Write a protein that binds this ligand. Structure first.
Ligand SMILES: CCCCCCCC/C=C/CCCCCCCC(=O)O[C@H](COC(=O)CCCCCCCCCCCCCCC)COP(=O)([O-])O[C@@H]1[C@H](O)[C@H](O)[C@@H](O)[C@H](O)[C@H]1O
Ligand SMILES: CCCCCCCC/C=C/CCCCCCCC(=O)O[C@H](COC(=O)CCCCCCCCCCCCCCC)COP(=O)([O-])O[C@@H]1[C@H](O)[C@H](O)[C@@H](O)[C@H](O)[C@H]1O
Ligand SMILES: [Fe+3]
Ligand SMILES: [Fe+3]
Lengths: 309, 309
């Protein structure tokens, strides 16, 4: 079933997409298109992919884009994690060491969250009778432990049902999304609720493909972070919580050593009173170490389309 | 910038998408996913594709799917034509010869058009003062010239502005879309209007990428055909009209020898009266030769999602 070799494929892709050019071309877009189309044609030949198969593939991609699920598909196939593996290797070749490890953004960041200094309450209290209270705190430092004041700590996470605000229109706008600027001691504190892990929408396109692959679409509980400061490399990270069934079986492959936190239980009446609470809560420490931005450093920032509100 | 070789890539794709499988897997979908993801990761390494670039690519695909333009993109990059090049080579290796040549379907077929025997008027007359009348006629035969009665001739084409019904909601439903069953003499006749060639939606995603490639998004005038009959291989084809600026410069590469027709001019008062018209018209002959369906023959039918009404 090999009807064309790669030479013949390359000649056809050139005739159709390069020889037809008139006037100015974006050379990078041209290069990438030619490469990816040649690779697709070769895979069609090697695997003898039939026209009905190609159309099913394109229809699936159309449906995924219509459901706004291609971000989730990038995560679940491991493409998003792969970009981080490449970034870590680039940084190693640059001699960049130290710093809290990176991991994936995921597709659910929303720009425009409430900003405050040193402290934020993340939740609206609508789940207070059905989920544990969580306090998260940490210090943001450079690699020698010097505190960083005014670092921008952006956090977002799921509610007690595994749902995120903005996407879940039942939640108040920006629920469980805050920006916290570190205080004079490099500290941030968030008063919030325990996140639960979650799966892909069960009738959606991402889970439809995972089902064909025999795979689950679940993530362990986690809290997402962007951390930035003048003079420092921007960090995209998370923590995961020890004890989760899916901790080392995340469908998006985001868990790493260095990013697992233990949720401690605080039942002590004195400490509860000190925090102005009425019941036991969970506490997580998550300190963040940022690497100073050097002239030689590859960028740690990523341009990506993100929701805003 | 090579951070991973293909061995390392293959091992990662396997860890993420194969080792994670539990219970039954669709082996074909698994095979194709593993191949395409490995090829994507390798192209990312070879071309040093940055995360911002990957996200732009996925955002473009999302936007294309939302605008229902991935079919048009498949046509414009030459993927749709490439499937026909493969089908023609498969048929040659099967010893299938003769028959009117195939070409691309395009993305604008709609199922459920009015059916009639031997004759159809395709247009609603709403453009009668602004476009030329066209009569199309032909005989459908086997490869030795024997007529075929009751062959299903499905035709669709653009109006005087280059727009298709269903997609252009201003047109009456099924305007310029008919199914004509061949009569006792193997004949079909369509009374219609001259199609004009057309381009991609100028502010749409397909033209946005073509612009980066320095390419136009125009097709020459044409009329699309499905032809089918019991005992015969289904045919997807078109004719193009001689004289079109874009005849041999179609952005979808669909023009072929054997499928260019000449539009003759009929100004003769006697002939005009015979056809029950009042003014000169254009006439096209387009005969169709179908190949008999043999046990050895590869399928000439393609499963594809198509609009219906
Ligand atoms: C550009 C790539 C090349 C494309 C062009 C070449 C692609 C070639 C693909 C060959 C496919 C083999 C199919 C064999 C038989 C199919 C039978 C079938 O059941 O059809 C469908 C299966 O077809 C697929 O899902 C294939 C998609 C894989 C391609 C994308 C991954 C590529 C990886 C990397 C590239 C970068 C990709 C980017 C990474 C983010 C079933 O539908 P569905 O239940 O899976 O989803 C269903 C579904 O389809 C419903 O219609 C929908 O309503 C519902 O919501 C959804 O859940
Ligand atoms: C799965 C493939 C891998 C993907 C994952 C890997 C992809 C890697 C791609 C790298 C891209 C290089 C970009 C370099 C710099 C980008 C700058 C820029 O201006 O961004 C944009 C350019 O990015 C692209 O268009 C790249 C798309 C190519 C990928 C698809 C073809 C693959 C071929 C075969 C595979 C089968 C494909 C199937 C064939 C059908 C500009 O936006 P736009 O004006 O082109 O369109 C605009 C636009 O983007 C607007 O936002 C929108 O509103 C408007 O309508 C639209 O017109
Ligand atoms: Fe998340
Ligand atoms: Fe057309």
């Amino acid at each position: 079933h090999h009807h064309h070799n790669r030479q013949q494929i390359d000649a056809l892709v050139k005739q159709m997409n390069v020889d037809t050019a008139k006037g100015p071309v974006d050379e990078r877009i041209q290069q990438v298109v030619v490469r990816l189309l040649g690779d697709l044609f070769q895979a069609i030949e090697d695997l003898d992919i039939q026209p009905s198969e190609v159309w099913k593939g394109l229809e699936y991609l159309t449906d995924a884009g219509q459901a706004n699920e291609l971000g989730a598909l990038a995560a679940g196939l491991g493409l998003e994690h792969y970009l981080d593996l490449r970034a870590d290797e680039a940084d190693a070749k640059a001699g960049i060491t130290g710093g809290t490890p990176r991991t994936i953004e995921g597709p659910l960041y929303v720009a425009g969250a409430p900003e405050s200094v040193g402290f934020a309450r993340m939740d609206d209290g609508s789940e207070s009778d059905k989920v544990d209270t969580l306090i998260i705190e940490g210090t943001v430092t450079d690699t020698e432990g010097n505190i960083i004041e005014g670092a921008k700590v952006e956090v977002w996470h799921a509610n007690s049902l595994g749902n995120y605000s903005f996407f879940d229109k039942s939640q108040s706008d920006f629920n469980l999304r805050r920006t916290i600027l570190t205080d004079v001691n490099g500290k941030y504190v968030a008063l919030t609720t325990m996140p639960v892990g979650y799966g892909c929408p069960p009738e959606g396109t991402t889970q439809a493909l995972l089902n064909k692959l025999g795979r689950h679409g679940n993530r362990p509980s986690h809290v997402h972070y962007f951390v930035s400061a003048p003079g420092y490399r921007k960090l995209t990270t998370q923590f995961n919580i020890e004890g989760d069934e899916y901790l080392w079986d995340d469908f998006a492959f985001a868990t790493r050593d260095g990013l697992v936190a233990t949720a401690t239980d605080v039942t002590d009446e004195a400490e509860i009173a000190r925090r102005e609470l009425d019941k036991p809560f969970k506490h997580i420490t998550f300190n963040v170490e940022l690497v100073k931005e050097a002239e030689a450093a590859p960028s740690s920032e990523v341009e990506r389309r993100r929701a805003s509100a």
